[PDB]
């Protein structure tokens, strides 16, 4: 047990447990599913609260005009990178007078979190960011992990028991590329409805939804903005 003390030690299997322990903080986050189609992208998050009267904690928040994002895990290191996220945005918007494609943009975040995962005494950053943005080639859905590995996809699901959403996704996510914004949002929440316990809501204000497009600027939709999205759907079976 004396060889497990420090961070620098690689396991007898060759793995650093500190990144794995930071993966636990991402799993304890709310269930959220980001996704994109071949035309428009929709990301959905879940709001949580410690007490009844406490307002539901927001996750999806607007940063760039064409880039929406969700959040999970450590909020501290997220708000830090959040101020750093605003920075690089206005940087290219000032010098280059153009936005930043999400491809090369996240490559800076992965390198930003590389130093704290290396030097002794530094800690990784638990991060649940699901990034959806539009460059000239269309939408992109990346992922974020304390290992600093972002994977381009059409959709991903993170948070508590969010693997159940992927199982609904893998067959549907291939068929969700052709659907317009309207049915996509309600089909989007159909993925997260099995991620919550089936015996209770799933209310209007406990869920986060946002939509962004090539010609559509990303707008946060919550509380009464979800009412048109939740209406006209079928309940889960028994």
């Amino acid at each position: 047990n004396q060889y497990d003390n420090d961070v620098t030690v690689w396991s007898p299997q060759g793995r650093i447990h500190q990144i794995e322990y930071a993966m636990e903080a991402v799993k304890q986050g709310s269930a959220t599913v980001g996704l994109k189609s071949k035309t428009h992208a929709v990301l959905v998050a879940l709001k949580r609260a410690q007490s009844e009267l406490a307002a539901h904690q927001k996750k999806i928040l607007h940063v760039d005009n064409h880039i929406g994002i969700s959040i999970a895990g450590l909020t501290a290191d997220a708000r830090l990178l959040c101020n750093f996220m605003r920075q690089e945005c206005l940087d290219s918007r000032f010098v280059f007078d153009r936005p930043l494609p999400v491809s090369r943009l996240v490559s800076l975040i992965g390198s930003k979190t590389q130093i704290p995962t290396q030097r002794y005494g530094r800690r990784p950053y638990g991060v649940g960011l699901l990034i959806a943005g539009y460059d000239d080639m269309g939408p992109h859905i990346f992922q974020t992990c304390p290992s600093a590995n972002y994977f381009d996809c059409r959709a991903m699901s993170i948070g508590a028991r969010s693997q159940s959403a992927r199982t609904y996704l893998e067959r549907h996510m291939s068929e969700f590329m052709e659907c317009n914004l309207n049915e996509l949002v309600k089909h989007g929440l159909r993925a997260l409805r099995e991620t919550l316990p089936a015996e209770q809501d799933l209310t209007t204000k406990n869920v986060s939804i946002g939509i962004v497009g090539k010609d559509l600027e990303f707008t946060i939709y919550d509380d009464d903005d979800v009412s048109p999205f939740l209406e006209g759907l079928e309940e889960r079976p028994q």
Partner: protein
């Protein structure tokens, strides 16, 4: 098996942050309440001996003219955050010619919520209750030593945060007037105090758009006492 306290333990999460939560057990508790008419907040000074002077220790301080606040746990720990937060709202009124209202104070403190670190220091275990009146009217916000800001309309801290909020979440239905919640708080106050209620035991925090400031006054603190 204590590694760096910052190192994300086997469970895992920060040690010192997990420890600083227990630091609330060694200090008194408060009770927040919010209403459309105004925001009222109560506390207990936890007087051990009569030698303690009531105005010496105060658990409610006003960060901005219209923005009050409440501390938790220790005193001097919040005092560094309290006093420095007063510089924040003042410079905002210098650049924008308008003071921070109930919101830009939160993000100001939320950015500094965890500044701690070993290399490149120690996080405070003091919970903060942010009151005030913004353009949306009277509002009360809450934050925790872990650093995550979650909006809590009426929040209680201290070791009584468990019990005091349990009955408090039921009575927050919007059909209750501000005057009904004022006397509802002292019911929980007399239950959580071992010493009989006196002028030196407790204080009140009430802020309203029309009546101000206020802050709070003197000799009106003793009127709610004898009514117990």
């Amino acid at each position: 098996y204590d590694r760096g306290v910052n190192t994300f333990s086997p469970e895992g999460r920060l040690f010192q942050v997990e420890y600083a939560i227990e630091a609330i057990k060694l200090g008194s508790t408060a009770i927040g309440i919010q209403t459309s008419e105004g925001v009222c907040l109560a506390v207990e000074k936890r007087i051990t001996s009569p030698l303690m002077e009531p105005s010496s220790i105060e658990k409610i301080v006003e960060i901005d003219a219209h923005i009050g606040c409440a501390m938790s746990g220790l005193i001097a720990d919040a005092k560094t955050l309290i006093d420095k937060a007063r510089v924040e709202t003042q410079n905002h009124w210098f650049t924008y010619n308008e003071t921070m209202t109930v919101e830009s104070v939160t993000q100001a403190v939320s950015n500094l919520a965890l500044q701690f670190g070993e290399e490149d220091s120690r996080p405070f275990g003091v919970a903060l209750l942010f009151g005030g009146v913004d353009e949306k009217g009277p509002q009360l916000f809450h934050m925790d030593p872990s650093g995550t800001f979650v909006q809590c309309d009426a929040r209680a801290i201290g070791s009584a945060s468990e019990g005091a909020q349990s009955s408090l979440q039921e009575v927050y239905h919007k059909s209750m007037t501000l005057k009904e919640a004022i006397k509802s708080s002292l019911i929980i106050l007399k239950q959580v105090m071992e010493e009989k209620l006196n002028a030196t035991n407790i204080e009140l925090a009430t802020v309203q758009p029309g009546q101000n400031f206020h802050m709070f006054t003197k000799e009106e603190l003793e009127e709610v006492i004898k009514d117990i």
